[PDB]
């Protein structure tokens, strides 16, 4: 038999935990402030209505009706099974470098258990002789900036991607703890994974409330809030503002990454997933908007402290969280209670997203091979051990150069291409009319005209607009003032093409393996596996023009 969620609340907290991560904190408020302030919410809320929710609703109903993972859900259109293998490999690529970012948060949490924070003075063994006591965002000779690039990263001992060196033993030990925690929270299925999210999915909300209450009291906090929610309606006349909201919506919801389809496969058949699609989509977007109030309270406080403008302090991820917040924290009364709670919140943010991505591989692959389904504990050991071994490249002395390469090419054009092909198969080849008949089979109500129009015309067109734009607006690899060698770009494109080439390859294998006439091998690959008996009866739905004209 197939296991199910112990309680309904377990499923809701798993989806919310995977959807909310560091991207909702260290990226979104900066984009809103830079683009249009309060006018950036118009294209942001528009793409959620027409593209964010239709894809979220589509994926949740796909797993519940079929009760299969990402790879093997394509029994409805056997020619598209290569798309499932593309999202599984992409989910493996992200794990090779996302657990390193979590290791940084654990390294900062272990250094906060003292009465003298390491990032306050310029008298340690990791300090350059030019360290100076405190565009403030570009200065690299401050105590907080010298503890990140010379105390944790050890970047000053590397000359580029041509010579990275041996892994750091301090960072290696922190990576070991993360993988062990990940294994024991995933080795028993969803009976154990459904209880871990009771703490990790709710802890950041508790800390964010306390940080917000104290944040608005600090001097200069009002200036940061006022500049955060300004209105500039003339910024909507530029095409870059609309593209910025289009990429943020697709990458912050995580719809089509193979995680939501696995979660919904353990749901009950009669569960109402139309309600779940709207509720969990809105919590993710509301969390991003609320988090900007707490962040810009600190930014306004920092600008008042240094007697500079708010435009000289604003930063983005990995420069605001690890270089900027520790500097402001070191002056807030206790300065130790605040340090502990801040880095505890980061751990709770990232742990849920790593669990969700790894389950998309175990559930997807165990549903393809039956032998793997019978050994869950041993198979979970293989996935985590491979992640730990292949993540040793990102904890070396030149580890940020490798992490930058993987971040650009593992996702992006490859993941945008796979989701575009998945929507085409379900909406057009499988049939929108058939899809709505399956939803009415479980819930008892047909979706409607608005939802059917967004699945067949609007969502495929929105995805195609982001795929083309991503290719056109591509630049060679760089990091700060370091320019990557030309060969490093060819290796980057090889990683991206590895997932994409899988889709055409499976079509050739499926065609060349099945027997029959030329027009017979084509019919088997487009007919659902449970409706193969009518192929020989010379009545194929997809071979009539009436099928393709459905709206």
């Amino acid at each position: 038999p197939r296991e199910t969620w112990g309680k309904k609340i377990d499923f809701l907290l798993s989806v919310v935990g995977f959807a909310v991560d560091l991207a909702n904190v260290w990226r979104f408020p900066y984009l809103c402030y830079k683009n249009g302030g309060g006018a950036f919410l118009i294209p942001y809320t528009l793409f959620l209505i027409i593209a964010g929710m239709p894809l979220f609703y589509m994926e949740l109903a796909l797993g519940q009706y079929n009760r299969e993972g990402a790879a093997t859900v394509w029994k409805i259109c056997p020619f598209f099974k290569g798309v499932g293998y593309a999202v599984i490999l992409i989910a493996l690529y992200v794990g090779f470098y996302y657990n390193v970012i979590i290791a940084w948060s654990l390294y900062y949490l272990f250094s906060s258990f003292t009465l003298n924070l390491p990032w306050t003075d310029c008298g340690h063994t990791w300090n350059s002789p030019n360290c100076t006591d405190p565009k403030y965002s570009k200065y690299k000779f401050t105590p907080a900036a010298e503890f990140y690039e010379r105390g944790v990263l050890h970047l000053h001992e590397s000359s580029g991607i041509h010579d990275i060196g041996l892994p750091q033993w301090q960072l290696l030990l922190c990576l070991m703890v993360v993988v062990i925690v990940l294994y024991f929270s995933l080795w028993k299925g969803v009976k154990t994974s459904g209880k871990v999210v009771w703490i990790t999915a709710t802890l950041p909300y508790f800390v964010l409330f306390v940080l917000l209450v104290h944040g608005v009291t600090l001097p200069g906090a009002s200036n940061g809030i006022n500049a955060y929610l300004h209105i500039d309606f003339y910024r909507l006349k530029e095409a870059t503002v609309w593209i910025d909201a289009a990429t943020q919506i697709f990458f912050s919801l995580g719809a089509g990454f193979g995680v939501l389809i696995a979660f919904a496969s353990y749901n009950k058949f009669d569960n109402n997933c139309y309600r779940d699609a709207l509720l969990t989509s809105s919590i993710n977007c509301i969390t991003s908007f609320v988090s900007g109030f707490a962040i810009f309270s600190i930014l306004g406080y920092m600008a008042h402290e240094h007697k500079v403008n708010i435009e000289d302090v604003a930063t983005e991820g990995a420069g605001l969280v690890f270089i900027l917040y520790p500097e402001a924290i070191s002056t807030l009364s206790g300065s130790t209670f605040w340090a502990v709670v801040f880095f505890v919140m980061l751990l709770a943010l990232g742990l849920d997203s790593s669990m969700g991505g790894m389950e998309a591989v175990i559930t997807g692959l165990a549903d393809d091979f039956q032998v793997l389904k019978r050994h869950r504990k041993l198979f979970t050991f293989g996935v985590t051990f491979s992640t730990f071994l292949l993540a040793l490249f990102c904890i070396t002395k030149g580890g940020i150069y490798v992490l930058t390469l993987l971040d650009t090419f593992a996702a992006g054009t490859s993941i945008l291409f796979a989701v575009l092909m998945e929507a085409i198969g379900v909406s057009w080849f499988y049939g929108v009319d058939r899809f709505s008949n399956d939803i009415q089979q479980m819930m008892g109500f047909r979706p409607g005209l608005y939802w059917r129009l967004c699945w067949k015309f609007v969502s495929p067109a929105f995805l195609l607009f982001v795929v083309v734009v991503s290719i056109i607006n591509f630049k060679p690899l760089t990091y700060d003032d370091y320019i990557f060698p030309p060969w490093a770009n060819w290796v980057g494109w090889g990683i991206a093409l590895s997932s994409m080439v899988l889709v055409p390859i499976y079509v050739i294998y499926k065609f060349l393996s099945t027997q029959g006439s030329l027009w017979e091998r084509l019919a088997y690959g487009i007919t659902p596996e449970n409706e193969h008996h009518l192929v020989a009866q010379r009545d194929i739905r997809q071979f009539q023009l009436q099928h393709w004209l459905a709206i």
Partner: peptide, 14 residues
């Protein structure tokens, strides 16, 4: 934004 290239989880000055 212009002059800042963002990928999935991190942004770099391009």
């Amino acid at each position: 934004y212009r002059g800042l290239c963002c990928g999935y989880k991190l942004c770099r000055p391009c």
